[PDB]
Symmetry: D2
Subunit: 431 residues, 4 copies
């Protein structure tokens, strides 16, 4: 059973709590799109673990590379190069858009965002950073100072020079222009404000292509592009955080490629390590060079570690080779339909959005008022689990809670439907 | 050969530079206390990789656990518990001093320091942090704002409320009291200054038991204790960073245990993951509880990941079981002697210090002036490599450069001597 | 002549420049609504000096009190009370709205704003301050960090926690709601943003009733009130800066009295000292009491100085007694008409706004595009002077430049017209 | 009587409290070295009011100029020059040391310090400011962020980049070097610390020649000079705050002239306005020019106001003409003797220090322990008043309280003795 008192005792005894509620179960294992409790119940994993596992749990491929490097070239002195590392950096420069040339191999996405931030500060000679008001970039310093969806209160001043502008939100729009959501004018309008608040030290703007934690918010057609122009105009970099959007999830190797808009620095992590702690940043050779004349430093213990580097390559590989970017479009599409189908059955389903295998369903009391469904969201969520389907709901202020659906790119068709089905059920029971 | 032009081309083409110089070689593998280039030359690893590898490269044990979890329970949703995790947290609460009860399982040491910092801020309601002027805590935000040994310039204001006090340095003392280094009075004296600079928002003091990057600086007899009293007095926590000192390196499971002084939060990483990216913090159940009433949040992708958690346990295990804490005292002692022996041969050897398997040798032009040996340090360093022994020199302002010697706790006797020998040679050639 | 080479030499030799252009003349004297150059040309003063002189230059009354105290009770030890001081504080508590009880007697408006700011910080336990994006509060620290109309660049980070929201601007509105300027929704909308940027440390909002330097921007009907509710809602004070609006200029003793909305702290200076350096703040007895349990400190050299205190009382007096608050409505009205009249003659006159004897005329290229008239504004300005009428134009980004008309409350009818006339002329010549 | 209930009622009713205790009396007038209560008791003014009145109360000269300008050229538009202004700026450039060329005419000393600070920030492109730990510069922003003697707690973060170093204190020295107070090494030692804390943004160091509020602390022989070299070395300005030291008080027109060391910017206020609110800064023509290419702005209401400008000139004049700089040495000397004489009588008199007519007497329990005399200081103080002599005691942490004696430069011999005498009495009664 999931009841091991000792387990729970200790769990109670020795764990720091750091957010949310602990799932009442004891996950004994995980394969493909499933995890299994201490009872052996298979739980359909619709979040790809913590939104990482892009090949699912325990993909034989990773298992091979892993074992392999673990016993061959594990960890090294940060100033010693090895193959995996050069291979990965290169691949990366290779599969990323033009203008992305050099990479830095780290461990976490907050980390990756910090590396990025420091780098723009170093190169602009500036310190002011701007993000979305519903952004999420990490638990650490800069990353954290740029994070607005949550975690700002009770932990001291943020980093000097932190600003945020509202994010273009077609579902709950608030900027009218001639009777329409002129989200482009919003942009303008925000920036003029920011402009007015600047000490004249704009260094960058950081952004998630689709705000995951912020509620699956997709930057509307032309935004990014407009955005980019905003930075360029003010001598700021545009850092694109693809911790969740990167690596095929949205149906392209990289979300920014959808807009055909390439940032100054791009950052990767979750989907890159596919469950393992590997992160990275990528930038143009020009920016790198300058960072370099300027002494850029971001030296870590695991910066450039063979084993981790090994793993992302393999991932990368697999991805390509299995055409998972596309598999993600297919299934992503299969899922949507299903979602809309439930949306047809159920009124509380106020919205179906996202891209690829990254969708969110917004819960409302009534479509007409788009009034957030309080408690409802979680009942559904709660019921899913009973039903043996793992899910994730996000609740910000101002909006119905959002289920964040992000199943493995290796997910199967059947797997899809199943989720879909348990969901309708859970919606059924939940009302 | 180490000459693969393509390798170097790409390396040149696609790598972000983030500090130092890249070793001109191509590390093909690593076992026990050695790494091996593309030619097959075995290089004696005196830094334990990036000061992590406490069981050396590719310890069969880790290789087993690793493979094992990789294929069984890899990565999970941050809000789902598993065995490795509870086991590790517990062990940890167990092998740490009394008063350390609950743990948080993360990935990096900067990370771990950030988690810690936020936590004191959250619990004190304050934001001012104080470290040593030659401190090193990480590349990220808070960690970085607390880091004084290096990296402060050209990247914007630091975090609000950052201060530093000089570190008790017996080798290059600057505080006289009745014709002696009254480092205790220094303490007092600094603090009164800090006190005077505070907005009245002292939240914590963060410190490395022995300043590694700062030049292997050991907090003198009674310091820590005195220090602790300084915090307690001002309602501040004392966070102890044992990224390098922790886990047996200094000859105790934990350096703070040497002083018999237990901090408010302790942080682990390098030596904990033994090469792999695993980190942690540990705190009292009281502090945890409060952090918790207060909403402490530090949610990550890899917070509480089975595979990594798995690995540290094994490490931990091995350590105990192989009595490596002690092996570290033994060999650590074997090494020192040797060091002093060279010190007997060579005048440029101004100082031999450290603890356990963490020693540093300070290079001077003359013992009498303790004038840093410029270029010398690196020649030696350079020559070691030729000799096929990996080493690390640190050069701060004000002091002869320091070799930081930190070989695996699994290092052999012979291995020791060998290093020792190549070193004398390298010193010989270097003069 | 205005040509004294020596004068100009020295002027060139020894003056720090601190903004704008120096009037090419040598003001020998000033009486009533006029200043006179070294040639004896009388210059009609439409700005009340630097927008202070509310009784004009050298009002016999002030001259009496001044002389008087100068020779009786000049300056004292900040901790010694005298009559003028208690009298003034009282009057003030008396002529200000209910809820304004205790006063602090200082010297400048920046000063006064600083005293205010510290006081809210002290009492809320918070540090975040919010102003208008086109605000002006002073050259000093906090005042300066809250100032957005200008002076933010090249002088370092601003004070931690500084934000701004756009100001309700009916002339160049940018917030649509159902095809109308819903400036109320703007409010809401801004605040939600701010809310999202807060570290949870909102202490206050500071605001000019009518943005003087920002272009004579009058807070639209219901704004203030709405605003106040915004603060109250978030536990913030509302500080009202009446450096220019206070003391009868807008046609009420205090602008806030127009809205019938009373702030947490009110600040006075320019119009209070009527040319002399006297400033003040006023707050409720409750806020004062608390500031006091909390150790509020704002001790100066001239805090509570008899002579200055003497002067404001007299002013105050005179004002009442001469019913200048009303005289300001009358003439203020006389002026407007005239303005609109010119507005009838001249298209470049895009807008006539303000209150009382505080009006501004916005210069545009064409009414239809409201495109700022570049150079034009200054020609007019330039021509006025030729014509022997002193004027002031303000030019922010985004809007036609604004003449800021603020003649003495003691101005005469004829005086009015004259200005009016020289203005039409100057407009005539300027096109 | 001093008992006017109404007076006290209102006083209670409507005064903001801003530090200290209100003298229980009602000052009806003030002439020469005296103030007089509502009973007519003459109180010997040993603090020159709030340490300003350098010609005493109501000097006929000021009374003349004052009346004069009040009725001729009172206040003007900040961008209009007049005689007094150019005259004063010039005089000033004239009586100040070489290298001080251009002046800015403001109203307060905090103001003056702010103007200064912004100016160094503007010209260095930096933002970090460094002062003494027992400094006092003003109640406002920057001034306040640089103030360490007091007022730092409970009012939010200070300005970004604020540091302090201990002040050279011969009376309670804490820096030993070979058994002596090597205050020079202290300097060095502090700076190395600061250096280590800098983000690399040192813009200036600000300092009082003699720390008035900090306890009459005189920068020891060679300090200033050493100091200056410290700045020059790091590209920082040295701003000298002579609010109290300036204008003849220490026995030179300017304290810095004593050291023969000229700062980058010098600031004046208290002693400059001799009771009236006039302040200023003075800088080299080079710094001014640059500030100017860079857009330096510090525009106020009273910047460059004829009346105030008029007053300081007159002061200045008088000073010269009456050879008060010297009168201050004479009497200053007369006072000291007297002080030491009491010091001979009384053990609680631990120290007699200062310069010119700026001395302080430190109260101790015993000379041997230099243990601050708690309560004692104030009894004396309290008794003085009874005796009808106004005095001021300062009590910081770590030191016996200090009477700050600063009588008018116009003080008489007899006046001196009298003070002296009431003091011995008060000491007598107080024990
Ligand atoms: C006490 C301490 N805490 C946290 C960390 C950071 O851990 P992470 O890097 O994994 O986040 C380090 C690591 N610093 C290194 C990489 C470094 C790098 C640059 C300067 C000094 C030391 P080094 O091993 O050479 O000392 C450390 O010493
Ligand atoms: C865009 C983005 N960038 C960086 C990161 C941080 O990566 P690391 O955690 O590994 O450093 C995250 C991860 N955030 C999680 C854990 C989170 C947690 C809390 C609030 C929102 C999202 P979630 O997966 O639930 O979205 C992320 O979304
Ligand atoms: C060196 C210095 N610079 C600026 C100023 C400020 O001038 P303004 O007050 O006019 O702006 C002062 C004045 N401080 C007094 C009021 C004070 C008050 C509180 C603590 C210490 C000293 P004090 O006269 O008692 O010393 C000062 O000493
Ligand atoms: C609302 C407000 N509050 C405080 C102050 C500052 O008072 P002090 O200057 O005396 O401290 C001013 C004065 N600003 C002037 C000098 C200015 C200067 C520069 C930009 C805008 C306005 P202006 O008169 O031209 O508007 C002010 O308008
Ligand atoms: K590494
Ligand atoms: K996890
Ligand atoms: K006073
Ligand atoms: K003026
Ligand atoms: Na690319
Ligand atoms: Na323990
Ligand atoms: Na009132
Ligand atoms: Na001079």
């Amino acid at each position: 059973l999931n009841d091991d008192a000792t387990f729970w005792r200790n769990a109670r005894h020795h764990l720091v709590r750091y957010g949310g509620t602990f799932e009442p179960m004891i996950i004994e294992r995980a394969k493909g799109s499933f995890v299994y409790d201490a009872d052996g119940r298979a739980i359909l994993d619709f979040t790809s673990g913590q939104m990482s596992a892009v090949l699912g749990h325990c993909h034989p491929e990773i298992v091979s590379v892993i074992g392999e490097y673990a016993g061959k070239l594990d960890h090294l002195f940060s100033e010693m190069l090895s193959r995996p590392v050069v291979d990965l950096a290169t691949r990366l420069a290779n599969i990323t858009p033009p203008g992305l040339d050099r990479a830095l191999l780290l461990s976490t996405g907050a980390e990756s965002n910090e590396a990025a931030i420091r780098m723009a500060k170093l190169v602009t000679g500036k310190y002011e950073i701007v993000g979305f008001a519903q952004s999420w970039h990490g638990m650490t310093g800069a990353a954290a100072s740029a994070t607005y969806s949550a975690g700002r209160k009770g932990v001291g001043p943020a980093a000097v020079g932190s600003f945020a502008i509202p994010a273009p939100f077609t579902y709950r729009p608030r900027f009218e222009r001639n009777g329409a959501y002129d989200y482009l004018a919003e942009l303008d309008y925000a920036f003029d404000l920011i402009d007015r608040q600047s000490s004249g030290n704009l260094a960058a703007f950081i952004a998630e292509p689709i705000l995951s934690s912020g509620g699956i918010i997709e930057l509307p057609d032309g935004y990014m592009a407009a955005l980019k122009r905003k930075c360029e105009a003010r001598g700021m970099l545009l850092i694109l955080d693809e911790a969740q959007t990167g690596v095929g999830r949205t149906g392209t190797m990289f979300a920014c490629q959808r807009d055909g808009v390439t940032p100054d620095i791009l950052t990767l992590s979750k989907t890159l390590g596919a469950g393992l702690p590997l992160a990275a940043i990528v930038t143009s050779a020009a920016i790198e060079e300058r960072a370099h004349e300027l002494g850029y430093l971001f030296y870590t213990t695991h910066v450039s570690d063979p084993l981790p580097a090994a793993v992302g390559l393999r991932v990368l590989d697999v991805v390509q080779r299995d055409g998972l970017v596309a598999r993600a479009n297919v299934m992503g599409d299969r899922l949507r339909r299903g979602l809309l189908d439930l949306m047809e059955r159920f009124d509380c389903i106020g919205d179906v959005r996202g891209r690829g295998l990254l969708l969110g369903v917004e819960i409302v009391k009534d479509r007409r008022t788009k009034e957030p469904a309080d408690g409802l969201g979680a009942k559904i969520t709660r019921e899913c689990m009973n039903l043996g389907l793992s899910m994730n709901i996000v609740q910000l202020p101002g909006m119905g809670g959002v289920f964040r659906i992000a199943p493995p790119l290796t997910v199967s068709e059947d797997e899809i439907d199943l989720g879909l089905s348990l969901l309708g059920q859970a919606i059924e029971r939940a009302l």
